[PDB]
Amino acid sequence: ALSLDQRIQTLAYEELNKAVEYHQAKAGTVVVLDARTGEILALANTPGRNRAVTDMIEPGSAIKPFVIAKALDAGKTDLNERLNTQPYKIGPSPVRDTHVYPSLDVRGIMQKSSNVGTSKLSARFGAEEMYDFYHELGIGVRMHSGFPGETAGLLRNWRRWRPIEQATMSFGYGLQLSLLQLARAYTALTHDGVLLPLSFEKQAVAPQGKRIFKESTAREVRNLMVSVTEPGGTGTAGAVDGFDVGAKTGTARKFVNGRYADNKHVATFIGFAPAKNPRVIVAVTIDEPTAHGYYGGVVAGPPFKKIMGGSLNILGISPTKPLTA
């Protein structure tokens, strides 16, 4: 009794391969989950290996919602604090955003994808604490999917970390996980603070998961993530008619020839809807887009929008606001 929904799988596979063609990308992957049970509704790749489970990627900015959640959960920040987000350096390493934002509140940090803001929240925790937190999200912990070629991913031992590393981990450098592991982590935000195991089998009742955040934290973070798909956000291309969508964009520089490249990227878009009471998670990654943009929002947003809107329809979920399209 497989959890796969054939209509969603077909939609995912078609929209993924079309986006990869349109952006003249090298490859891509899509994961669709039930946001309340962790059932895997669709898993699609471009021709070749099962990259969704086999390929380790850097999460990039798709890790930031968890850093922000953890800071709010532990009371290290709140919705009122405006953080100084001026860029800075440690030795040769910069910690900088796409623009110089003099200050942002936590909403802004999410909305604009501020690396500086995220790093400062992370810096409020000790190294070992952050290491255990990344491990609790499942980073470095094998999925045991049943598929061959699956690895655990990479979480470097905290005793080894240089001063800069905790900072750069907070915007997704140096950690490695599969798209499936990353999609799994988002269940802690959608299932009210409780991380789910994921399953290829239909579930009559949500498995027991593991609490990572307070319900209230997860609820506030989901609302912050709606800012990503609204005007002002990095992810407006992923907005879905009739629904509020909480999402996060990511754009990761590819590490090639012992060097992070200036113009070779992995584009990611992960989101859930309905934002207040989510039922579906869709996670999209596009490797090396070379036409019509390279950022997560512009490249992976449009297929996210079609896969999410279509999935909501297939599952019979009612729009939460009037339609306009």
From Swiss-Prot:
Q: Write out the GO cellular component annotations.
A: plasma membrane
Q: List the disulfide bonds.
A: none
Compartments annotated for it: namely: Cell inner membrane
Give one GO molecular function term: penicillin binding
The keyword Hydrolase belongs to this UniProt entry's keyword annotation: yes
The record's active-site residues are S61 (acyl-ester intermediate)
Major location (coarse): membrane
The pathway this protein participates in, as annotated, is: Cell wall biogenesis; peptidoglycan biosynthesis
EC class, as a word, reads hydrolase
Enumerate the catalysed reactions.
Answer: Preferential cleavage: (Ac)2-L-Lys-D-Ala-|-D-Ala. Also transpeptidation of peptidyl-alanyl moieties that are N-acyl substituents of D-alanine
Tell me which domain of life the UniProt entry assigns to the organism this sequence originates from: Bacteria
Entry coiled-coil feature ranges: none
Q: Does the keyword Glycoprotein apply?
A: no
Q: According to the UniProt entry, what is the EC number of this protein? A: 3.4.16.4
GO biological process: one example: cell wall organization
Q: Which UniProt keywords apply?
A: Antibiotic resistance, Carboxypeptidase, Cell cycle, Cell division, Cell inner membrane, Cell membrane, Cell shape, Cell wall biogenesis/degradation, Hydrolase, Membrane, Peptidoglycan synthesis, Protease, Septation, Transmembrane, Transmembrane helix
This protein's membrane topology, according to the annotation, is:
Single-pass membrane protein
User: Could you tell me what this protein does?
Assistant: Catalyzes cross-linking of the peptidoglycan cell wall at the division septum.
- Similarity comment text for this entry: Belongs to the transpeptidase family. FtsI subfamily.
Q: What else is known?
A: This protein was sequenced in penicillin-sensitive strains LM306, and FA19, and in penicillin-resistant strains CDC84-060384, CDC84-060418 and CDC77-124615. The sequence shown is that of strain LM306.
Description of its domains: The enzyme has an N-terminal penicillin insensitive transglycosylase domain (formation of linear glycan strands) and a C-terminal penicillin-sensitive transpeptidase domain (cross-linking of the peptide subunits).
Per its record, how is this protein called by name?
A: Probable peptidoglycan D,D-transpeptidase PenA
Q: Which organism is it from?
A: Neisseria gonorrhoeae
The beginning of the lineage is: Bacteria, Pseudomonadati, Pseudomonadota, Betaproteobacteria, Neisseriales
